[PDB]
Amino acid sequence: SQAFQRQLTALIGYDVTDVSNVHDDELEFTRRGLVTPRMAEVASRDPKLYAMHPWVTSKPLPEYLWKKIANNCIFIVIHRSTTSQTIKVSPDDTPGAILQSFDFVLRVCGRDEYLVGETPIKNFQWVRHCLKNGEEIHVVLDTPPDPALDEVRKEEWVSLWDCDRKFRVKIRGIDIPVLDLTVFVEANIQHGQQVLCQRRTSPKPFTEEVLWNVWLEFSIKIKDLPKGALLNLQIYCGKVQLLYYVNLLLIDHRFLLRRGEYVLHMWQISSFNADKLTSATNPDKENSMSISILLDNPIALPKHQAEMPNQLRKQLEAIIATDPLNPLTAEDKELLWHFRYESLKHPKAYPKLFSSVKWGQQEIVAKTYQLLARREVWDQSALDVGLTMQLLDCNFSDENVRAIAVQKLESLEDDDVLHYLLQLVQAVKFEPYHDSALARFLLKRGLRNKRIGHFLFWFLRSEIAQSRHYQQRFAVILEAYLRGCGTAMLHDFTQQVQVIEMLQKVTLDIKSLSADVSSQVISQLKQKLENLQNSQLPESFRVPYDPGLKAGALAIEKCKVMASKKKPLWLEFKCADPTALSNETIGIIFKHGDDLRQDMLILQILRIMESIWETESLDLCLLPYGCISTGDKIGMIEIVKDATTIAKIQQSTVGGAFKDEVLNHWLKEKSPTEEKFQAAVERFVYSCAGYCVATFVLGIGDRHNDNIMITETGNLFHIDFGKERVPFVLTPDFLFVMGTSGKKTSPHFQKFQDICVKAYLALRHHTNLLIILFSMMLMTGMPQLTSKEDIEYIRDALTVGKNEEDAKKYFLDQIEVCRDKGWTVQFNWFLHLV
Ligand SMILES: Cc1nc(N)nc(-c2cc(C3CCOCC3)cnc2Nc2cnc(Cl)c(NS(C)(=O)=O)c2)n1
Numbered sequence: 001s002q003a004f005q006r007q008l009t010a011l012i013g014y015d016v017t018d019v020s021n022v023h024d025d026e027l028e029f030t031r032r033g034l035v036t037p038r039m040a041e042v043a044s045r046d047p048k049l050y051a052m053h054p055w056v057t058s059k060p061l062p063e064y065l066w067k068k069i070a071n072n073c074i075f076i077v078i079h080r081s082t083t084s085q086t087i088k089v090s091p092d093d094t095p096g097a098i099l100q101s102f103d104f105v106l107r108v109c110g111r112d113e114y115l116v117g118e119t120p121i122k123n124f125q126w127v128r129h130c131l132k133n134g135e136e137i138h139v140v141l142d143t144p145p146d147p148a149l150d151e152v153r154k155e156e157w158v159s160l161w162d163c164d165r166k167f168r169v170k171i172r173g174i175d176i177p178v179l180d181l182t183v184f185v186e187a188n189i190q191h192g193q194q195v196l197c198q199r200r201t202s203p204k205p206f207t208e209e210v211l212w213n214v215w216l217e218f219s220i221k222i223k224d225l226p227k228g229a230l231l232n233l234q235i236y237c238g239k240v241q242l243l244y245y246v247n248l249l250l251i252d253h254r255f256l257l258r259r260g261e262y263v264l265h266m267w268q269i270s271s272f273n274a275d276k277l278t279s280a281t282n283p284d285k286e287n288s289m290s291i292s293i294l295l296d297n298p299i300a301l302p303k304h305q306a307e308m309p310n311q312l313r314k315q316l317e318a319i320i321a322t323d324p325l326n327p328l329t330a331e332d333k334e335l336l337w338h339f340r341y342e343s344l345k346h347p348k349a350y351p352k353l354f355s356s357v358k359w360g361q362q363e364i365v366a367k368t369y370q371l372l373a374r375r376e377v378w379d380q381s382a383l384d385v386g387l388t389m390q391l392l393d394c395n396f397s398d399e400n401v402r403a404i405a406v407q408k409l410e411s412l413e414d415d416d417v418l419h420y421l422l423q424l425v426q427a428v429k430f431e432p433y434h435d436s437a438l439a440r441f442l443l444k445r446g447l448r449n450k451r452i453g454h455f456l457f458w459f460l461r462s463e464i465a466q467s468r469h470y471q472q473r474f475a476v477i478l479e480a481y482l483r484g485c486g487t488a489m490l491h492d493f494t495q496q497v498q499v500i501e502m503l504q505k506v507t508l509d510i511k512s513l514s515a516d517v518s519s520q521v522i523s524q525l526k527q528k529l530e531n532l533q534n535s536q537l538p539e540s541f542r543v544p545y546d547p548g549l550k551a552g553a554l555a556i557e558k559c560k561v562m563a564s565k566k567k568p569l570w571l572e573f574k575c576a577d578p579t580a581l582s583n584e585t586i587g588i589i590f591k592h593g594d595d596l597r598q599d600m601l602i603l604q605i606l607r608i609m610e611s612i613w614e615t616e617s618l619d620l621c622l623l624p625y626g627c628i629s630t631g632d633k634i635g636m637i638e639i640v641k642d643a644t645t646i647a648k649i650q651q652s653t654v655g656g657a658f659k660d661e662v663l664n665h666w667l668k669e670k671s672p673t674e675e676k677f678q679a680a681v682e683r684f685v686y687s688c689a690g691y692c693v694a695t696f697v698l699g700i701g702d703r704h705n706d707n708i709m710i711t712e713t714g715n716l717f718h719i720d721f722g723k724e725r726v727p728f729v730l731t732p733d734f735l736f737v738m739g740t741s742g743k744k745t746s747p748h749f750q751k752f753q754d755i756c757v758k759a760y761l762a763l764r765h766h767t768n769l770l771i772i773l774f775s776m777m778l779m780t781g782m783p784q785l786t787s788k789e790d791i792e793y794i795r796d797a798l799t800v801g802k803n804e805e806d807a808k809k810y811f812l813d814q815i816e817v818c819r820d821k822g823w824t825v826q827f828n829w830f831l832h833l834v
Pocket residue numbers: 562564566568589591599625637638639640641643644645648709719720721722
């Protein structure tokens with residue numbers, strides 16, 4: 001009867017039904033509320049295309065991928081059983097057209113990946129992958145997968161503007177189980193980041209319980225309170241210092257004003273952090289500080305039923321023209337609002353326009369909704385993700401404003417959703433209420449596409465497993481997905497969850513036995529792994545970072561604990577698919593100890609940078625490997641085949657000291673033919689510039705060379721994204737490959753500069769998008785770096801306000817700063833330990 005709910009809880013990692021940490025029914029209200037959204041998307045989804053989940057794109061084929069096609073022909077090798085043909089086809093041919101040259105369907109050899117539907121083969125991502133990598137398109141004639149397998153289980157389920165009183169709250173007192181300075185309570189009325197009104201209490205001596213019993217009367221009137229308005233209670237001591245915080249929505253999910261007694265358990269500090277805005281309370285009731293308060297005045301918020309001077313218009317357009325991180329003066333705001341209707345014609349003015357609204361004022365908000373009612377330009381405008389994300393950040397608490405951002409997301413094809421999914425999932429932390437347009441948007445795009453749904457699951461589970469601030473919310477959303485994804489997915493998820501759970505235990509036990517690394521622990525590992533092969537590891541499970549790949553039995557011989565501070569497991573799996581015409585294992589690094597969430601964000605931005613470069617016909621051969629945060633301080637990473645670190649190349653031919661020549665003839669040896677050395681050297685030139693530019697922008701380029709890797713075919717790539725300085729790594733050994741020895745300029749070194757610039761200016765063309773991603777990253781992902789100082793790095797990095805020519809100068813100077821420092825920093829890392 002209810003075994004399903006116990007099944008669901010073990011996949012989510014949290015008990016949705018639990019009510020030990022709440023003071024209203026918003027979570028439960030959101031469960032019931034999310035049912036329609038699910039049911040509708042389940043109802044309407046095409047079952048045949050659902051089971052096969054064809055991953056396709058409407059984007060044009062890039063210039064560099066065309067060049068790898070001769071005479072509008074591509075080869076496709078179909079397999080029968082032991083036999084195989086090799087058809088010729090044109091790019092624009094549909095899989096129907098191709099199949100009718102021989103019901104069946106064309107499945108990719110090795111992977112649960114299908115080539116079906118009315119798109120030209122040039123528009124499948126697998127075909128674009130084969131062409132990019134220079135591999136041939138193998139596929140096995142197969143039966144379509146039964147949609148009966150994807151079945152879903154059968155489911156069962158006084159006006160506010162008429163009160164001229166000033167809002168007030170009573171602070172009864174504060175209490176803390178365990179604790180010579182004094183302390184007070186600060187009360188703020190807030191809308192987004194904006195503080196509409198503020199009041200303090202008189203200081204008292206800080207004992208383990210402190211009672212005040214005061215009313216704090218605020219200047220704001222009850223009618224002027226906007227929907228979303230948080231009451232934010234903070235505790236300072238003292239030269240002041242913040243110790244604890246907590247928030248309470250003054251208008252609930254049913255539009256009623258909040259009333260009565262509350263005992264709220266607070267969050268402790270150790271700055272803009274997403275955690276500071278949460279409606280959640282601390283679930284640790286035994287140790288947390290608690291504040292007690294009283295609200296009393298049932299009141300309900302209603303639901304809404306010339307030419308301009310030459311000079312002033314330019315003043316307006318300069319304001320619209322600035323970056324998202326450029327502040328607005330009171331002068332700027334009054335202008336933007338006065339000329340309201342001129343500003344509405346420009347989609348780009350929107351973030352700044354709605355940051356000019358006085359939200360603590362009933363009539364202004366009313367006027368603002370009349371503005372949103374009259375939006376023809378916005379609804380017509382071409383989708384701009386940069387502008388869309390802006391309206392979903394921490395500055396916008398108004399549901400109606402945020403809703404026009406989601407409206408624009410509706411038009412994104414699936415491929416583009418994948419590109420932004422993680423960030424949109426992190427953007428849910430900025431919503432005031434648990435139920436929201438954004439939550440529903442993610443829910444249904446995941447219910448429509450198995451690939452989206454897969455990564456949606458893992459991104460949610462990641463955040464539920466290591467955030468007490470938002471797990472309650474993310475949990476509710478996950479359940480809502482799992483109840484729609486289909487029995488075949490829930491099966492697949494349950495195997496993935498088990499495998500990682502079995503592997504965690506092994507890691508806990510192993511870690512204890514160490515203090516470098518012995519080989520008795522290597523056998524102890526291989527012992528327990530062999531013991532897991534028959535109890536109770538399933539025959540097959542999907543690779544969470546690459547769900548097409550089913551991985552089966554273990555190659556116990558090749559598995560080993562890594563020579564590293566955290567003792568990660570270096571595992572290797574056989575493939576479960578007989579039809580895979582290869583024999584390379586699946587290599588996974590399983591890591592317990594650290595939080596991989598920051599590693600995801602960075603790698604996901606790397607993929608966004610690629611897609612940007614793609615739109616300007618550029619390819620810089622970045623290598624963003626699979627990396628999934630799977631649980632509390634655990635996760636999996638992809639092993640890149642035929643790869644080694646730049647530092648280990650030094651420990652061979654030198655073994656403190658560094659030599660220039662070494663890298664070049666490491667490549668020379670690993671390349672058989674001369675052409676392949678020359679192929680592999682150019683891949684190094686692209687790689688290096690791409691990774692140089694990309695780290696400079698993100699401000700993570702000054703790295704230690706045991707964290708830079710390279711493939712035998714010359715592809716460079718950074719790893720592990722957890723005095724005097726260098727803007728990025730361009731060490732003399734790299735330069736040696738490029739054919740410059742101190743101070744020269746090779747035909748290769750100049751092309752490196754030629755690309756570096758093209759890359760940089762290309763990124764610059766999407767300044768706003770990158771500025772807003774960076775901002776969100778730091779606020780939702782990295783609780784270390786969150787201030788004006790931190791976030792404003794990228795403004796400088798992308799050289800806002802400068803022109804295309806002067807920026808080029810700026811970057812080429814950064815190339816020379818590196819040149820001028822050689823091995824100095826690299827040595828200094830080594831020196832500083834000693
Ligand atoms: C993505 C990838 N691919 C490959 N081939 N290798 C690695 C990798 C390898 C190695 C050693 C292997 C033995 O030689 C010394 C280095 C260490 N780390 C690697 N990648 C990695 C990336 N990101 C993180 Cl967060 C970590 N975690 S860590 C440094 O093991 O704690 C590892 N990572």
